[PDB]
């Protein structure tokens, strides 16, 4: 029996706080990404990379923030973007009420073990069955062009596509995702945390906010909350596999000037 009471109002104020902070830290929102992907925007139409010739023409026309072999140049761009995302995700984490009042080593631990799960959650916003938006919406790289890259690069992004097509069928919006990502950041089961209880306390309040958001926002999906927790479980798997591919590449094949 749901009521609009001081408790529910506080959970709506938390959801709004997170949404505002989310779209501040990540201004290519799902709403804007979907508008670009469905051609329902007045913004510039992305340049499509669908084969080796369009990639060569794209390196020019698409204007990347970054500055011999195609697959390695693409992987290096991917690496650069993930470094910028770690800073964006940290800036979002600092907005979650309670997070900066945690032990600094636990703040670092939650972000260290959380950022990949959050990257692949947010990447789904940018993906459809054809491909992925790159360079903040200026480019679109096809899923089959990425699969055509030589081993081991060909198989790098395909598991993220697989996750995204099922994740996107849940039809979450930015208001849902902002809370979902906060829930993933405040995971009390990360290795090497010093003080778990205060993390579980924040996560409990975020779970209450997520449950209410999904009830208000998704009238025809009664178990969406459960389906989202099932996805948080599945992201753990995606990231385990991802760190394995990253090792193969490191042992078998220059980085962001922020590291230098």
């Amino acid at each position: 029996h749901m009521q609009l009471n001081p408790e529910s109002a506080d959970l709506r104020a938390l959801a709004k706080h997170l949404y505002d902070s989310y779209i501040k830290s990540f201004p290519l929102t799902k709403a804007k990404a979907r508008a670009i992907l469905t051609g329902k925007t007045t913004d510039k139409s992305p340049f499509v990379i669908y084969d080796m010739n369009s990639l060569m023409m794209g390196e020019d026309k698409i204007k990347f923030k970054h500055i011999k072999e195609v697959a390695i140049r693409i992987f290096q761009g991917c690496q650069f973007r993930s470094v910028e995302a770690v800073q964006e995700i940290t800036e979002y984490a600092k907005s979650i009420p309670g997070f900066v009042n945690l032990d600094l080593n636990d703040q670092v631990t939650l972000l260290k073990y959380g950022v990949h799960e959050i990257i692949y959650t947010m990447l789904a916003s940018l993906m459809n069955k054809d491909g992925v938006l790159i360079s903040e919406g200026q480019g679109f790289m096809t899923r089959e062009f990425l699969k055509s890259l030589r081993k081991p690069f060909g198989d790098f992004m395909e598991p993220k596509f697989e996750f995204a097509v099922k994740f996107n069928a849940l039809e979450l919006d930015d208001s849902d995702l902002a809370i979902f990502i906060a829930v993933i950041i405040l995971s009390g089961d990360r290795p090497g945390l010093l003080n778990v209880k205060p993390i579980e306390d924040i996560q409990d309040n975020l779970l209450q906010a997520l449950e209410l958001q999904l009830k208000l926002n998704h009238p025809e999906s009664s178990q969406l909350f459960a389906k989202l927790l099932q996805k948080m479980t599945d992201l753990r798997q995606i990231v385990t596999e991802h760190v394995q591919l990253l090792q193969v590449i490191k042992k078998t094949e220059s980085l962001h000037p922020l590291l230098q």
């Binding site: 940290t90 600092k94 600094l104 703040q107 670092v108 972000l111 950022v115 980085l255 590291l259």
Partner: peptide, 11 residues
């Protein structure tokens, strides 16, 4: 290098 970027971004 992940932790370095995080500590950098936190402080």
């Amino acid at each position: 290098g992940l932790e370095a970027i995080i500590r950098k971004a936190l402080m």
